[model samples]
Target: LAAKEAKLRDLEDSLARERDTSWRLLAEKEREMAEMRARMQQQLDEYQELLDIKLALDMEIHAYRKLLEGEEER
Candidate 1:
């Protein structure tokens, strides 16, 4: 009976240790996921800003070409 009790205690201690380790790892993973999301959002914002600039430049280029063609015809 004493040996059985000792074995049960060992098993319980091991289970508790495993539970703590699992919780710690889960918390760390969540933190990493949050950081990744933040970085992706930042990158998306920068990409949108660049796209806007490119569109404005394209419009300016088209206008300049039209003006040049008209001047040449004159």
Candidate 2:
């Protein structure tokens, strides 16, 4: 009976340690995910700005081409 009690205690301690380790690893991964999410959002914002600039430039080019074609016809 004493040997059985000792084994049970050991098993309980091992389980506690495993639980703690698992929680710590989960927290670490959550933090990493948060950081990645922030980086992804920043990248998305930058991409949007670039897209806007490209659109504006495209409009300007189209206008200039129209004017040139009109002048050439004159």
Candidate 3:
């Protein structure tokens, strides 16, 4: 009966150690995911600014082209 009790105690200690290890790994993964999300958001904001600038430039070009064409007709 003493030997059986000793084996049970050993099994319980190993299970606790495994549980601790699992939680630590999970926390590291969560941190990495958060960092990736932040970087993705920053990239999206930069892309939107670039697109807006390009659209404004396109409009200016079209207006200049129309004015130049009218001058040539005279």
Candidate 4:
């Protein structure tokens, strides 16, 4: 009977330890996912700004070329 009780207690303890380890692993995985989300957002912001600048620059160059061509014809 004592040996049976000891075996029961040992099994319970191991189960608890395994549960704790799994929770710890999941928490760390969540943190890593959060980190990557922020990094992706940063890159998206950079791309948006670069695209805006390129569009504005093209507008000015196109208008300037049109004016120069008109003057040459006159």
Candidate 5:
């Protein structure tokens, strides 16, 4: 009983230190993730704007092509 209790205390000390280190690591990653997601969403949203403008441009091109075809038929 006595030797086992001493060994348990040794393991407990090491376990607590590792727990502290992991807790701080978790905080660091959470902060970085927050910043990264913010900028990532911002970049993604800018592409959405470009896509809409390009879509409208294609629609206009299609309209002009149809107009050209109708004139050629006559």
Candidate 6:
């Protein structure tokens, strides 16, 4: 009976340690995920700003082409 109790105690201690380690690893992963999300959002915002600039430039070019064509006709 004594030997059995000792074995049980050892098993319980090991389980506790494993549980603590698992939680620590989970928290670390969560933190990494959050940082990745932030980086992705920043990249997305920059891409959108670049797209807006490109669209404006294209519109300006179209307008200039139309103006030049009218002048040629005149």
Q: Quick one: best TM-score, which candidate?
A: 1
The TM-score, computed over Cα atoms with residue i paired to residue i, of candidate 5 is 0.60
Where does candidate 2 stray beyond 4 Å? none
The order by descending TM-score is: 1, 2, 6, 4, 3, 5
Question: Which whole-number lDDT from 0 to 100 does residue 63 have in model 6?
Answer: 99
* lDDT (C-alpha) at residue 40 in model 1: 100
Among residues 3 or more apart in sequence or in different chains, the pairs in candidate 1 whose N, CA or C atoms overlap within 3 Å are none
Predicted candidate 1 versus true structure: per-residue lDDT over 1-74, tens digit per residue: 95999999999999999999999999999999999999999999999999999999999999999999899994
Compute the lDDT of residue 64 as modeled in candidate 5: 99
Per-model CA lDDT versus the true structure = 0.98, 0.98, 0.95, 0.96, 0.96, 0.98
Q: Which is the better candidate, 3 or 5, if ranked by TM-score?
A: 3
In each prediction, how many residue pairs overlap at the backbone (N, C-alpha, C within less than 3 A)?
Answer: 0, 0, 0, 0, 0, 0
- For residues 1-74, write the lDDT of model 2, one tens digit per residue: 95999999999999999999999999999999999999999999999999999999999999999999899994
- Candidate RMSDs in order: 1.1, 1.2, 1.7, 1.7, 3.4, 1.5
- Tell me the TM-score of model 6: 0.85
lDDT tens readout by residue for model 3, 1-74: 95999989999999999999999999999999999999999999999999999999999999999999898895
Pairs with backbone N, CA or C atoms under 3 Å apart (clashes), candidate 3: none
lDDT of 6: 0.98
List where candidate 4 sits over 4 angstroms from the true fold: none
Inter-residue clash pairs, candidate 2: none
Question: lDDT (0-100) at residue 49 of candidate 2?
Answer: 96
For model 5, where is the 10-residue window of minimal lDDT? 65-74
Cα lDDT tens digits for candidate 6, 15-58: 99999999999999999999999999999999999999999999
